[PDB]
Coordinates of C-alpha atoms and ligand atoms in Angstrom, one line a residue:
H1 CA -18.4 -24.3 -6.8
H2 CA -18.0 -21.6 -9.5
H3 CA -19.4 -21.0 -12.9
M4 CA -16.0 -19.6 -14.1
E5 CA -12.9 -21.7 -14.1
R6 CA -9.2 -20.9 -13.5
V7 CA -7.4 -22.7 -16.3
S8 CA -3.7 -23.5 -15.9
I9 CA -1.7 -22.7 -19.1
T10 CA 1.9 -22.8 -20.2
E11 CA 3.5 -19.4 -19.9
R12 CA 4.6 -17.8 -23.1
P13 CA 8.4 -18.0 -23.3
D14 CA 9.2 -14.4 -24.1
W15 CA 6.5 -12.5 -22.2
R16 CA 8.9 -10.6 -20.0
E17 CA 10.8 -9.3 -23.0
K18 CA 7.5 -8.5 -24.8
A19 CA 6.7 -6.3 -21.8
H20 CA 10.2 -4.8 -21.8
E21 CA 9.8 -4.1 -25.6
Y22 CA 6.4 -2.4 -25.1
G23 CA 7.7 -0.4 -22.0
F24 CA 5.6 -2.3 -19.5
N25 CA 7.1 -2.7 -16.0
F26 CA 5.0 -5.7 -14.9
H27 CA 6.2 -5.4 -11.3
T28 CA 3.9 -4.5 -8.4
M29 CA 4.0 -0.8 -7.7
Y30 CA 1.5 1.7 -6.0
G31 CA -1.3 -0.8 -6.2
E32 CA -0.6 -1.8 -9.8
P33 CA -0.7 -5.7 -9.8
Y34 CA 2.0 -8.1 -10.8
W35 CA 1.2 -9.7 -14.2
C36 CA 0.8 -13.5 -14.3
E37 CA 0.0 -15.9 -17.1
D38 CA 0.6 -19.4 -15.7
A39 CA -3.2 -19.4 -15.7
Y40 CA -6.2 -17.7 -17.2
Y41 CA -9.9 -17.3 -16.3
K42 CA -12.5 -18.7 -18.6
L43 CA -15.9 -17.1 -18.8
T44 CA -19.0 -17.6 -20.9
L45 CA -20.6 -15.2 -23.2
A46 CA -23.7 -15.0 -20.9
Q47 CA -21.5 -14.0 -18.0
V48 CA -19.8 -11.2 -20.1
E49 CA -23.1 -9.8 -21.3
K50 CA -24.2 -9.8 -17.7
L51 CA -21.1 -7.9 -16.6
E52 CA -21.6 -5.4 -19.3
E53 CA -25.2 -4.8 -18.4
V54 CA -24.5 -4.4 -14.7
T55 CA -21.5 -2.2 -15.3
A56 CA -23.4 0.3 -17.5
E57 CA -26.3 0.5 -15.0
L58 CA -24.0 0.9 -11.9
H59 CA -22.4 3.8 -13.7
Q60 CA -25.7 5.5 -14.2
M61 CA -26.6 4.8 -10.6
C62 CA -23.3 6.6 -9.7
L63 CA -24.1 9.6 -11.7
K64 CA -27.4 9.8 -9.8
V65 CA -25.4 9.8 -6.5
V66 CA -23.2 12.7 -7.7
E67 CA -26.3 14.7 -8.7
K68 CA -27.8 14.4 -5.2
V69 CA -24.5 14.9 -3.3
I70 CA -23.5 18.0 -5.3
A71 CA -26.9 19.6 -4.4
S72 CA -26.6 19.4 -0.5
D73 CA -23.9 20.8 1.7
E74 CA -24.9 18.0 4.1
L75 CA -23.9 15.3 1.7
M76 CA -20.7 17.1 0.5
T77 CA -19.8 17.1 4.2
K78 CA -20.7 13.5 4.9
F79 CA -18.5 12.8 1.8
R80 CA -15.7 14.7 3.5
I81 CA -15.1 17.0 0.4
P82 CA -13.1 19.9 1.8
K83 CA -15.3 22.9 2.1
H84 CA -12.8 25.2 0.5
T85 CA -13.0 23.0 -2.7
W86 CA -16.8 22.8 -2.8
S87 CA -17.2 25.4 -5.5
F88 CA -14.4 23.8 -7.6
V89 CA -16.0 20.4 -7.4
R90 CA -19.6 21.6 -7.9
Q91 CA -18.8 23.8 -10.9
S92 CA -16.9 20.8 -12.4
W93 CA -20.2 18.9 -12.3
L94 CA -22.4 21.8 -13.3
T95 CA -20.3 22.6 -16.4
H96 CA -20.6 18.8 -17.3
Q97 CA -16.8 18.3 -17.4
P98 CA -16.1 15.0 -19.3
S99 CA -14.8 11.8 -17.9
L100 CA -12.3 9.4 -19.6
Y101 CA -12.5 6.2 -17.5
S102 CA -13.6 4.3 -14.3
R103 CA -13.1 0.8 -13.0
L104 CA -15.7 -1.1 -10.9
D105 CA -14.5 -3.7 -8.4
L106 CA -17.1 -6.5 -8.7
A107 CA -17.3 -9.7 -6.6
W108 CA -18.6 -12.5 -8.8
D109 CA -17.9 -16.1 -9.8
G110 CA -20.8 -16.6 -12.2
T111 CA -23.3 -17.6 -9.5
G112 CA -25.8 -15.2 -8.1
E113 CA -25.5 -11.5 -8.9
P114 CA -22.3 -9.4 -9.1
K115 CA -21.7 -7.1 -6.2
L116 CA -20.1 -3.6 -6.3
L117 CA -17.3 -3.5 -3.8
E118 CA -16.1 0.0 -4.9
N119 CA -15.9 2.3 -8.0
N120 CA -12.3 3.2 -8.8
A121 CA -13.3 6.4 -10.7
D122 CA -10.3 8.6 -10.3
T123 CA -6.9 6.8 -10.9
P124 CA -7.9 3.1 -11.5
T125 CA -4.9 0.7 -11.8
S126 CA -4.1 -2.1 -14.2
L127 CA -5.2 -0.2 -17.3
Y128 CA -2.2 -1.3 -19.5
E129 CA -2.6 -5.0 -18.8
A130 CA -6.4 -4.9 -19.3
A131 CA -6.4 -2.9 -22.5
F132 CA -3.3 -4.0 -24.2
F133 CA -1.1 -6.7 -22.7
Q134 CA -3.8 -9.3 -22.2
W135 CA -5.0 -8.7 -25.8
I136 CA -1.5 -9.5 -27.1
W137 CA -1.6 -12.5 -24.7
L138 CA -4.8 -13.7 -26.4
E139 CA -3.5 -13.3 -30.0
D140 CA -0.3 -15.1 -29.0
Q141 CA -1.8 -18.1 -27.2
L142 CA -4.3 -18.5 -29.9
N143 CA -1.6 -18.7 -32.6
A144 CA 0.3 -21.1 -30.3
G145 CA -2.9 -23.2 -30.1
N146 CA -3.0 -23.2 -26.3
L147 CA -6.6 -21.8 -26.2
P148 CA -10.0 -23.0 -27.5
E149 CA -10.5 -22.3 -31.1
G150 CA -13.3 -19.7 -30.7
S151 CA -11.8 -17.8 -27.8
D152 CA -12.7 -14.1 -27.4
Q153 CA -12.1 -11.5 -24.7
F154 CA -14.3 -8.9 -23.1
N155 CA -12.0 -6.0 -23.9
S156 CA -12.7 -3.0 -26.2
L157 CA -10.7 -0.7 -23.9
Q158 CA -8.2 0.5 -26.6
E159 CA -10.8 1.2 -29.2
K160 CA -13.1 3.0 -26.8
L161 CA -10.2 5.0 -25.3
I162 CA -9.2 6.3 -28.7
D163 CA -12.8 7.1 -29.7
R164 CA -13.2 8.9 -26.4
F165 CA -10.1 10.9 -27.1
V166 CA -11.5 11.8 -30.5
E167 CA -14.7 12.9 -28.8
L168 CA -12.8 15.0 -26.4
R169 CA -10.7 16.7 -29.1
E170 CA -13.6 17.2 -31.6
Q171 CA -16.4 18.1 -29.3
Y172 CA -14.8 19.4 -26.1
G173 CA -11.8 21.2 -27.6
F174 CA -9.1 19.0 -26.2
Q175 CA -6.5 19.8 -28.8
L176 CA -3.5 19.8 -26.5
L177 CA -3.5 17.4 -23.5
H178 CA -0.9 17.5 -20.8
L179 CA -0.3 14.3 -18.8
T180 CA 1.3 14.2 -15.4
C181 CA 2.2 12.1 -12.3
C182 CA 4.4 12.2 -9.3
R183 CA 8.1 11.9 -10.1
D184 CA 9.4 8.5 -9.0
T185 CA 6.1 6.6 -9.1
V186 CA 4.3 5.0 -12.1
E187 CA 5.7 7.0 -15.1
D188 CA 7.5 3.9 -16.3
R189 CA 4.7 1.5 -15.4
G190 CA 3.5 2.2 -19.0
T191 CA 0.1 3.8 -18.2
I192 CA 1.1 7.4 -19.1
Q193 CA 2.9 6.3 -22.3
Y194 CA 0.0 4.1 -23.3
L195 CA -2.6 6.8 -22.9
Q196 CA -0.3 9.2 -24.6
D197 CA -0.2 6.9 -27.6
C198 CA -4.0 6.5 -27.6
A199 CA -4.4 10.3 -27.5
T200 CA -1.8 10.7 -30.3
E201 CA -3.8 8.2 -32.4
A202 CA -6.8 10.4 -31.8
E203 CA -4.7 13.3 -33.2
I204 CA -4.4 15.0 -29.9
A205 CA -1.1 16.8 -29.2
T206 CA 0.3 15.6 -25.8
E207 CA 3.0 16.7 -23.4
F208 CA 4.2 14.9 -20.3
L209 CA 5.6 16.6 -17.3
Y210 CA 6.0 15.6 -13.6
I211 CA 3.7 17.2 -10.9
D212 CA 6.7 19.2 -9.7
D213 CA 7.3 20.6 -13.2
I214 CA 4.0 22.4 -13.1
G215 CA 4.4 26.2 -12.7
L216 CA 2.1 28.8 -11.2
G217 CA 1.7 31.7 -13.6
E218 CA 1.1 35.4 -12.9
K219 CA -2.7 35.3 -13.1
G220 CA -2.9 31.9 -11.4
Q221 CA -2.8 29.7 -14.5
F222 CA -0.8 26.4 -14.5
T223 CA 2.2 26.3 -16.9
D224 CA 4.3 23.5 -18.4
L225 CA 8.0 23.0 -19.0
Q226 CA 7.8 25.6 -21.8
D227 CA 6.1 28.2 -19.5
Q228 CA 3.0 27.7 -21.7
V229 CA -0.6 27.6 -20.3
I230 CA -1.9 24.1 -19.4
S231 CA -5.6 23.9 -20.5
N232 CA -6.2 20.2 -20.3
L233 CA -4.4 17.9 -17.9
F234 CA -4.6 14.1 -17.4
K235 CA -3.3 13.2 -13.9
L236 CA -2.3 9.9 -12.3
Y237 CA -2.7 11.4 -8.8
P238 CA -6.0 11.1 -6.8
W239 CA -8.3 14.0 -5.9
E240 CA -8.2 12.8 -2.3
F241 CA -4.7 14.1 -2.1
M242 CA -5.0 17.1 -4.4
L243 CA -8.0 18.6 -2.6
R244 CA -6.0 18.7 0.7
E245 CA -2.7 19.8 -0.8
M246 CA -1.0 23.1 -0.1
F247 CA -2.2 25.2 -3.0
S248 CA -5.6 23.5 -3.6
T249 CA -7.3 26.8 -3.2
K250 CA -5.6 27.7 -6.5
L251 CA -7.7 24.9 -8.2
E252 CA -10.8 27.0 -8.6
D253 CA -9.1 29.7 -10.8
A254 CA -6.3 27.6 -12.3
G255 CA -8.2 27.4 -15.6
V256 CA -7.4 23.7 -16.1
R257 CA -9.8 21.0 -17.2
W258 CA -8.9 17.7 -15.5
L259 CA -9.1 14.0 -16.4
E260 CA -10.6 12.6 -14.3
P261 CA -12.7 15.7 -13.6
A262 CA -13.0 17.0 -10.0
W263 CA -16.6 15.7 -9.6
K264 CA -15.2 12.1 -9.8
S265 CA -13.9 12.8 -6.3
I266 CA -17.5 12.0 -5.2
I267 CA -17.7 8.6 -7.0
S268 CA -14.2 7.5 -6.1
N269 CA -15.2 7.9 -2.5
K270 CA -16.3 5.1 -0.2
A271 CA -19.2 7.3 0.9
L272 CA -20.6 6.3 -2.5
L273 CA -21.5 2.9 -1.0
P274 CA -24.1 4.1 1.5
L275 CA -25.6 6.6 -0.9
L276 CA -26.1 3.9 -3.5
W277 CA -27.8 1.6 -1.0
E278 CA -30.1 4.4 0.2
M279 CA -31.1 5.5 -3.3
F280 CA -31.4 2.0 -4.7
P281 CA -32.4 -0.2 -1.7
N282 CA -32.0 -3.9 -2.4
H283 CA -30.6 -3.4 -5.9
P284 CA -29.4 -6.8 -7.1
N285 CA -25.8 -5.6 -7.5
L286 CA -25.4 -3.5 -4.4
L287 CA -24.5 -4.5 -0.9
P288 CA -26.0 -3.1 2.3
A289 CA -23.8 -0.1 3.3
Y290 CA -24.2 2.6 5.8
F291 CA -22.3 5.5 7.3
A292 CA -20.8 4.2 10.6
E293 CA -21.8 7.3 12.5
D294 CA -25.5 6.8 11.7
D295 CA -28.0 4.6 13.4
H296 CA -28.2 1.7 10.9
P297 CA -29.5 -1.9 10.8
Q298 CA -27.2 -4.3 12.5
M299 CA -25.2 -6.7 10.3
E300 CA -23.8 -10.2 11.2
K301 CA -20.4 -9.6 9.5
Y302 CA -19.3 -6.5 7.7
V303 CA -16.4 -4.5 6.4
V304 CA -15.3 -1.0 7.5
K305 CA -13.8 1.4 4.9
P306 CA -12.5 5.0 5.2
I307 CA -14.1 8.0 3.5
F308 CA -10.6 9.2 2.5
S309 CA -7.7 6.9 1.6
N310 CA -7.0 0.1 5.6
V311 CA -10.1 -2.1 5.3
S312 CA -10.9 -4.5 8.1
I313 CA -13.6 -7.1 8.8
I314 CA -15.8 -7.3 11.9
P315 CA -10.1 -0.5 15.8
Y316 CA -10.9 2.4 13.4
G317 CA -13.8 3.9 15.3
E318 CA -17.0 5.3 13.7
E319 CA -16.0 8.8 12.5
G320 CA -15.3 9.0 8.8
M321 CA -16.1 5.4 8.2
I322 CA -18.7 3.5 6.2
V323 CA -19.7 -0.1 6.9
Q324 CA -20.7 -2.6 4.1
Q325 CA -22.1 -6.1 4.4
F326 CA -19.4 -8.7 4.1
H327 CA -19.5 -10.6 0.9
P328 CA -16.6 -13.0 0.4
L329 CA -14.7 -13.0 -2.9
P330 CA -14.8 -16.4 -4.7
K331 CA -11.8 -18.6 -3.9
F332 CA -10.0 -20.3 -6.7
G333 CA -7.3 -22.6 -5.2
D334 CA -5.5 -20.6 -2.5
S335 CA -6.5 -17.1 -3.8
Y336 CA -9.6 -14.9 -3.8
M337 CA -10.6 -13.5 -7.2
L338 CA -12.0 -10.1 -8.1
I339 CA -13.4 -8.7 -11.3
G340 CA -12.3 -5.2 -12.5
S341 CA -14.8 -3.9 -14.9
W342 CA -13.9 -0.9 -17.0
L343 CA -15.9 2.1 -18.2
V344 CA -14.8 4.5 -20.9
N345 CA -17.0 7.5 -20.1
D346 CA -20.3 5.7 -19.7
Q347 CA -19.5 2.6 -21.9
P348 CA -18.5 -0.7 -20.5
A349 CA -15.2 -1.7 -22.1
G350 CA -14.3 -5.1 -20.6
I351 CA -12.7 -6.7 -17.6
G352 CA -9.5 -7.6 -15.9
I353 CA -9.2 -10.3 -13.3
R354 CA -7.1 -10.0 -10.2
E355 CA -6.0 -12.5 -7.5
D356 CA -4.7 -12.2 -4.0
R357 CA -4.0 -14.6 -1.2
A358 CA -5.7 -12.4 1.4
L359 CA -9.3 -11.3 1.7
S360 CA -1.3 -8.4 -6.0
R361 CA -1.7 -10.5 -9.2
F362 CA -3.3 -9.9 -12.6
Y363 CA -4.5 -12.7 -14.8
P364 CA -5.8 -12.6 -18.4
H365 CA -9.1 -14.0 -19.4
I366 CA -11.1 -15.4 -22.3
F367 CA -14.7 -16.1 -23.0
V368 CA -16.2 -18.8 -25.2
Ligands
ADP1 N1 -18.0 -5.9 1.3 C1 -16.9 -6.7 1.2 N2 -16.9 -8.0 1.5 C2 -15.8 -8.8 1.4 N3 -14.6 -8.3 1.0 C3 -14.4 -7.0 0.8 C4 -15.6 -6.1 0.8 N4 -15.1 -4.9 0.5 C5 -13.8 -5.0 0.2 N5 -13.4 -6.2 0.4 C6 -12.0 -6.7 0.2 O1 -11.1 -5.6 0.5 C7 -10.3 -5.3 -0.6 C8 -10.1 -3.8 -0.7 O2 -11.4 -3.2 -0.8 P1 -11.7 -2.0 -1.7 O3 -13.0 -1.4 -1.3 O4 -11.5 -2.5 -3.2 O5 -10.5 -1.0 -1.2 P2 -9.4 -0.3 -2.2 O6 -10.0 1.0 -2.6 O7 -8.2 -0.1 -1.2 O8 -9.1 -1.2 -3.3 C9 -11.0 -5.8 -1.8 O9 -10.2 -6.2 -2.9 C10 -11.7 -7.0 -1.2 O10 -10.8 -8.1 -1.3
NI2 NI1 14.0 -5.6 -24.5

């Protein structure tokens, strides 16, 4: 029993070439899901307003977590933030460094309350499909008459991303934005090029360069492929790796503003889950979660997750682990379904639906 349905649909005949034409590599890579459109998910307006409401509040609840964590060496330690980066992460929060985006993982089928599994607040995947590709899919399958006549979609990602980039340029001085990722990863997924086009629309000058193209200047500044100073850098590379990398002590004095900013390392951290539960006990959209090392109430079945990264249900031990009450994803046919609910800064911007056979695939949605 669900209050959303998975509706089979006839695939568009030229969607693979539409992807190729837009520079979208729809294949699975580095956690990016494989696009599918032999089906779509059908929601109601009520469900979407609910998702929006919950998404905006959960985001505010996450900012409260950061505020508390940043102010106690104890919590910065329980969050495994490397001590030699504490000043870098703290100053990033105390100077109010701006955020571009986040994606909440929400378990929900329309029944009961949506539950926060995790907040992908650093390098969330499936951006292109959610913002752009599934919107073209909607426009197309409407014109082909394969969707109900009043079909809409919970998706303002592109509009909000461009408006956020205008905000960054006009009020935070982001005139030139560098964009970067690891060579031989997701540069041809389409994410970097799509965000670059959004920044360009917002009249931001952009430059792409690979992680290994970044140079270390004489006074510690980071420099691009024209040996010029990098002031603002979008990265598709997680803080969990960067804060442990060889020249991470250079971060504090590099003179670079980052998207996502360093303080997002605290939100995009599984330790978020116990802190949310302690600060907001029995919140309707939270699950019981505790640090594994702590004396905590016993749970019938739960999930163990690392504080820096494989999830399992009850081999990992206690140290560096959180536990969270098990809450099964809704099953549609042979697959479990998960909602990915996007934020642009603090503004809910819509959802993408993902499926997997195991407790891999992205499906479009509509709402009526
Ligand atoms: N509390 C939970 N109850 C049931 N399933 C869960 C729970 N937490 C995570 N899962 C399952 O594990 C998968 C990965 O968990 P997640 O916290 O999203 O890790 P990752 O950061 O690797 O995506 C989720 O897609 C979901 O299928
Ligand atoms: Ni082509």
